[PDB]
Amino acid sequence: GHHHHHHLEASADEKVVEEKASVISSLLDKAKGFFAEKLANIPTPEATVDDVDFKGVTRDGVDYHAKVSVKNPYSQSIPICQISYILKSATRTIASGTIPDPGSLVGSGTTVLDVPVKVAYSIAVSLMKDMCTDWDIDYQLDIGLTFDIPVVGDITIPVSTQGEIKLPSLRDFF
């Protein structure tokens, strides 16, 4: 493809994503030890990433609609103030980001929220294998959404999800 013979810290995009990711992972890590003891005594809503819908394409990577379901028994609308977006692709390169308010909890119930996910985009910006026809790609999605509660403050719950995506024989969808 075209992603070859470029040397500026390997690739500025590939590099700057890691910059962001490193800091993001540190904030996720503060919450990790926090969950174990504090959020076991402090009832907090649980979120989870589920699946991605084959939806559309972007000229770089694909544009999917991923599900993030949150279930919360509390009759209050908790908005997700700061949602950490971590898109991954097999071995190397990811796409990191943070979306301000992607949705809110309905109050007492389960609610599926969605985020625009750039799938395969990561491996594309890095090297881009060569879009094939009928391609099972090793994809992962990790999301750390932040709930705010007067009990403590900010809790970023990183719900990790690993799977696989089958990218069909369009060949010009990637």
Specify the DSSP element, H or E, that contains 123. Answer: helix 121-126
Order the strands of the 139-148 sheet from edge to edge.
Answer: 94-99, 83-89, 139-148, 154-162
**Beta pairing partners, 114:** 67
Tokens in use for 76?
């209050």
Specify the DSSP element, H or E, that contains 148. Answer: strand 139-148
Q: Cα(12)–Cα(163) distance, rounded to whole angstroms?
A: 27
**Beta pairing partners, 148:** 154
Cβ-Cβ contacts under 8 Å for 92 (sequence gap 6 or more): 14, 123, 126
Is the CB of residue 45 less than 8 Å from the CB of residue 71?
Answer: yes
What are the backbone dihedrals phi and psi of residue 34, each rounded to the nearest 5 degrees, phi first? -70, -40
What are the backbone dihedrals phi and psi of residue 153, each rounded to the nearest 5 degrees, phi first? 175, -115
In Å, what is the CA distance from 139 to each residue of 16, 110, 116, 125? Answer: 20, 26, 15, 15
- The residue behind tokens 């394409």 is 57
Tokens in use for 152?
């403590």
Is the CB of residue 48 less than 8 Å from the CB of residue 174?
Answer: no
What are the backbone dihedrals phi and psi of residue 139, each rounded to the nearest 5 degrees, phi first? -115, 150
**Beta pairing partners, 165:** 137
Is the CB of residue 66 less than 8 Å from the CB of residue 114?
Answer: yes
Residues belonging to the chain? 174
Domains and CATH numbers, the chain: 10-39 (1.20.5.170), 40-174 (2.60.40.1820)
Rg (C-alpha) for the chain, rounded Å, is: 17
